[model samples]
Target chain A: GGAYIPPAKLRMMQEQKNSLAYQRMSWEALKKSINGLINKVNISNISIIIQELLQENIVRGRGLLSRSVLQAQSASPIFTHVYAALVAIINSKFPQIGELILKRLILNFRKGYRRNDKQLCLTASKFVAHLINQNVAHEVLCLEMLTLLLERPTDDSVEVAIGFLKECGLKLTQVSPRGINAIFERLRNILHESEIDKRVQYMIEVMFAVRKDGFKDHPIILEGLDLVEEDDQFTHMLPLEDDYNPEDVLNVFKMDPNFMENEEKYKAIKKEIL
Target chain B: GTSREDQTLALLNQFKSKLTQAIAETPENDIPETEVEDDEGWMSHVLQF
Candidate 1:
């Protein structure tokens, strides 16, 4: 028994080794391999690809992703390649596998959060937006990712977050009621201050239309909803001229409104994603 | 638009179709949820994030 290795077992082990052999690759080369794989991806090597990503230690350092692990692992450079390939391929035929990449995206975004790495945070946000279309993201996961952007509360962060919320808003009713609830809940959390910004009012107004429930009795959402109804800048939907585009709306209001010209304003507006 | 901005919005539209084919082509049942868990007391993990 000590010496006997069955042919079938040997073949299976060899098969595992066969794909993971790419592990011995240079980061750039492995990335090229993944890019090709993305064009024709499958499950057989998906796990292996993720494993290679996790194990590759170049520039490894811990961030928010470490919090998700029982044993915190440092952030690695492998996914710099992993993301480009993964984002190009996430969709519903194999939602489960799509989430493999999803988990890493969350972790990568968290890494950005810990270091105040704006670019990574924004990149991760975009990846999550793409995932929602793919039909693999859960409400909690998506909500929290947006919340992560809110925690830092930068104009750029808020900008992408609102953009992402618009994308998710269109799909949440189709996917998760709980997801929709969490979104309003986050918006309410951010709008906690008494003088809610008219800009946010201008932004999230259409988001309510995305929810089948339409409006919640929750005091905060009612307050938020009320803000939109009475707001003069959006009479007869005049401001929205077109359909939902978060950044487009954001750009429309980047400057202080004429009405608010006399009022003092914060130098930067940051919305909480958490 | 800069290359970075262009890359930001580009869709990897075929991830699922190809992955589904991979399942059929190779015959593996992969459910990503089963692979990772929040069992290690990170306060249900969701709330932590």
Candidate 2:
């Protein structure tokens, strides 16, 4: 939809040549090896491995990312996966990488296969949400992306764009709390003016995820959405608890918008976990 | 100009529709299954991994 890029996901490529473990291996060795070190990418280890790779060449690292592959194909699985990895590596501290990756994806979106445009933009939207979450990009970016999707109005792009907007709405409350109103305003306009029937369906779904602040108190919400009620709704977007581990010696009560990615994540006992 | 206006209206109509059935959360089982191999293998040990 919009030309935003992504922050992250997924691990391993069955093809040894493309797998992260083998990304650094020699061509002959990649061929010789039975299998590359394949495993689900642990979010906690992102900083540990990615920081060193960024040390070498932030934009060009391959610790778990590769942007050079499959730019020509809009629907290529590996391209989306690698691009997601690039976004995953980005954080509030890394605005430069966010801008570069987002711009690069948008550039390829314009030039890539017309048939695959929506899917590519779908990947682009995922990254855009992350950049928005970190406050690297603005809410207008979300609005702009939605416009692109509406113009195309394919079922696929509409679905992905709606999901992206919902995620962005949540992230906005963290970094740009005021942007949530704009999200609804834009969605309100589109819901009426929208083209695809499926588009309205997604817009309605996203409406449920938008800011619930004072919204429940407002009588207008009585007709808004009761597909589910709003009993404990404020807590998901609101930080009601300390996210620190029980063992944490010294803990701060400050709620992190990106607290999941923050160092406290390193304390989590994950293995059987993602 | 009339032709173009009609065309835009038709496009808009294509975008809007009366809901006939609720969209399912998961696609129906009838679609042929395509098994794309998982990208990564499991690493149980995070610290030693």
Candidate 3:
């Protein structure tokens, strides 16, 4: 036997609130209510609703910007859900607009925040990089933010910078050589420290690969290697020998003659000890 | 012959009666007039099946 119950007064209240939320509520109030509802509803159900809302607003050309503004204002516990919702809205309707907003957010993070604010920087970088990967061309503004971030001396800033470089390296190589050089110079400064020596090494090696002519027959590679060699702190922190492949190192160096010579000196020292 | 089944049947019957009464008591003319030419109409078409 199947029993059917009438919708209760609470359900009526919920429906009324939902209607008001969709129609006339301010972003802050709606966000607060939505956050409360997210906890009460099953996550799967909420996800389904979010997905449907995104599809309706974004893909179908219904109020995508409004929805994004709403979701961005909301403080959902699930970062992924909020992220996905914002991304979907951006992807569908106002991609350039979304990127501009994120670019502003990144600038705010750099100019107004502290060095240890990793989560804020990481979240902003991850969102921007995700947009770029979708073939969105926010590289110029995004690179400016990355360059600002590079000035900070923090592992999170370095990590996020590296992630941004990895995502848009080719685009960045084409558009802003000056910015790339700035990033390299900043990384070079950081590499002097023992904690981030390997990252600095990898970054410089990759930069050389990107623009061999920039550092052709130059002393930058040798200087970097010497720093790594002389720093006992770096020697202790170096990755295991098994993880180090000579061929990969050679391939990266072969991109430039000067780099090749530096590699030779580095190998000679390592081999003498063996 | 089971009490649970009997209770379920009674509940369903009561639900049907309540639903019917609520529908009948609601004023038909109170429903908002469907505006055809507004931008909201186009949005409704885009959003709804």
TM-scores for the candidates: 0.36, 0.40, 0.38
List candidate 3 stretches off by more than 4 Å: A1-9, A12-51, A54-92, A95-104, A135-137, A151-156, A174-182, A185-274, B1-49
lDDT per residue as tens, model 3, A1-274 = 8776664753676543333343333334333443444334333354454443332212111123333432353333234223433343333333333433443444434533456566555555554544343333345655666666566556655666775565455545555667776776666666765476566567656755655554342222112122111111110111111122122121111122133343354345334322
DockQ of each: 0.02, 0.02, 0.01
Model 3 C-alpha lDDT per residue in residues B1-49, reported as the tens digit of each score: 2323433443454354445445444455346345567444331233324
- Estimate the TM-score for candidate 3: 0.38
> lDDT at A28 for candidate 1?
36
True contacts kept of 2: 0.00
TM-score of 2: 0.40
lDDT of 2 at A205: 56
> Pairing residues by index, what is the TM-score of model 1?
0.36
Query: Can you rank all candidates by lDDT, best first?
Result: 3, 2, 1
What is the lDDT of every predicted structure here? 0.38, 0.38, 0.42
Ranking by TM-score: 2, 3, 1
